[PDB]
Write a protein that binds this ligand. Structure first.
Ligand SMILES: Nc1c(S(=O)(=O)O)cc(Nc2ccc(S(N)(=O)=O)cc2)c2c1C(=O)c1ccccc1C2=O
Ligand SMILES: N[C@@H](CCC(=O)N[C@@H](CS)C(=O)NCC(=O)O)C(=O)O
Ligand SMILES: [Ca+2]
Lengths: 198, 198
C-alpha cells in the first residue's frame, strides 16, 4: 500500500511506527506538521488525535493499534499466541506509565514538580519489575527482538531526558537499549531522524 | 484450557474479559479478592497489577492484552487485519478516556473537580466523535459484533453512573448499548453477575 504517517515534528507516540517501518524496510511518507497546522489537521481526525496512518486512502488511528497492525505476520510480533500476548502486555505496562505524565500542563512549575515526583517515587518500582522480568535473557520476549524491545528503547529514551540516572541500578536494561540501537536498520533511522527534544 | 481470573470484586478492568468468556461460552474461575488480601497477593504479581489471568498454570497480565489473546481467531476479532486495527483503536480510545479519571486519588476535591472537568468538557466531545464514527451502522466495526462493541457497553455503563445524561443527544449509542445487552450469552451474564458500583 501507499502509507502516510501524520504527527508533530517529534518522536513522541509516532516513533514506535517509525521504528517498525525502518526495521521492515518499508517506504512511507513521514508527514510532520506544525502547531499552526493543528486546527485544520484536527478537523480531519476521527477522534481529534494523532498519530494517524493513512493506508491506500483509509485512516488508521491509535499509535499502539497501528504498531500492532504493521507487525502482524512479521518476526517483530512474537512467535506464539502466548508470546504475542506477552508482547502486548509489556507494551501496555510501558504505555500506562508514559500516560501518567502531565504532558499538557500549562503551568511549568507544577508540570516540572509532577514529572520529578513520578520519576523519583514511581519509576524505580517499574524499572525493577522490568529488570526482574528480563532476567539474564537477551530480549524481553522469546529469543529474538520484538516491537516491545523497540518500545522499551523509545520510552526509556524520553524518560532519560528528564531523569539521567534512571537506569544506574539496571545495567541489563541499558544493554537491551544498546542492542536495539545496534540493529542496523534501527541505528540508521536513529542517526538520520530530525533531532527533537521529545 | 483451565482459566482463572483474579480481580477485585468489581466490573472495572476485568469486565471485558468476563464478557468475552460469556459470549464464547467458556468456563472459568472468577476469583474476586478483598482489599485485605491485596498487599499479600500484589507482591507476587510480575508488575503488581490486576487483573491477571492464569491459563493452564501460566500467568498473563494487562486486561486488553488478555482480551485480545482470547478473541484472536474468533468472530469477536475483526474480519481483516485492517478491521482488527480499527477494533484495537476504538478500545484504546475508550481506554485512554477511562484512564484519564483519577480512580485511586485520595483528596475529595482534586478528585471531585477532575471528574467534573472530564465529565463536563471532554466526555461530550468523545460521545460526539463516537456517534459520528458509528453513523447509522449496526456495530462499530464491520458487519457484526466485536469486542470493541463490548468495551463501549462496559465503558458507557460506568460513565453513566457519574453522568446519567451522557447519551441524551446520542440515541444511536444507546441503541448500540442495547444491541450488546440483548445478545443472549451477554444478557445471561448481566443478570447473573455481582451487583457492584464499579
Ligand atoms: N511528547 C508527548 C506528549 S506531548 O506532546 O508533550 O503533549 C504527550 C504524550 N501523551 C499523551 C497521551 C494521551 C493524550 S490524550 N489525547 O489526552 O489522551 C495526550 C498526551 C506522550 C508524549 C511522548 O513523548 C511519549 C513518548 C513515548 C511513549 C509515550 C509518549 C506519550 O504518551
Ligand atoms: N492497564 C492495566 C491497569 C492495571 C492496573 O493499574 N490495575 C489496578 C486496578 S483497576 C491495580 O491492580 N492497581 C492496584 C494497585 O497497584 O495497588 C490493565 O488494564 O490491566
Ligand atoms: Ca494505552
Amino acid at each position: 500500500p501507499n502509507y502516510k504517517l501524520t504527527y508533530f515534528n517529534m518522536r513522541g507516540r509516532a516513533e514506535i511506527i517509525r521504528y517498525i517501518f525502518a526495521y521492515l524496510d518499508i517506504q512511507y511518507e513521514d508527514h510532520r506538521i506544525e502547531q499552526a497546522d493543528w486546527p485544520e489537521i484536527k478537523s480531519t481526525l476521527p477522534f481529534g488525535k494523532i498519530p494517524i496512518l493513512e493506508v491506500d486512502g483509509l485512516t488508521l488511528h491509535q499509535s499502539l493499534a497501528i504498531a500492532r497492525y504493521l507487525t502482524k505476520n512479521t518476526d517483530l510480533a512474537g512467535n506464539t499466541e502466548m508470546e504475542q500476548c506477552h508482547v502486548d502486555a509489556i507494551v501496555d505496562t510501558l504505555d500506562d506509565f508514559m500516560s501518567c505524565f502531565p504532558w499538557a500542563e500549562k503551568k511549568q512549575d507544577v508540570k516540572e514538580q509532577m514529572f520529578n515526583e513520578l520519576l523519583t517515587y514511581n519509576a524505580p518500582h517499574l524499572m525493577q519489575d522490568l529488570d526482574t522480568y528480563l532476567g539474564g535473557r537477551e530480549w524481553l520476549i522469546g529469543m529474538s527482538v520484538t516491537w516491545a524491545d523497540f518500545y522499551w528503547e523509545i520510552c526509556s529514551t524520553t524518560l532519560l531526558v528528564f531523569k539521567p540516572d534512571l537506569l544506574d541500578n539496571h545495567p541489563r536494561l541499558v544493554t537491551l537499549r544498546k542492542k536495539v540501537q545496534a540493529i542496523p536498520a534501527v541505528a540508521n533511522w536513529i542517526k538520520r531522524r530530525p533531532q527533537t527534544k521529545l
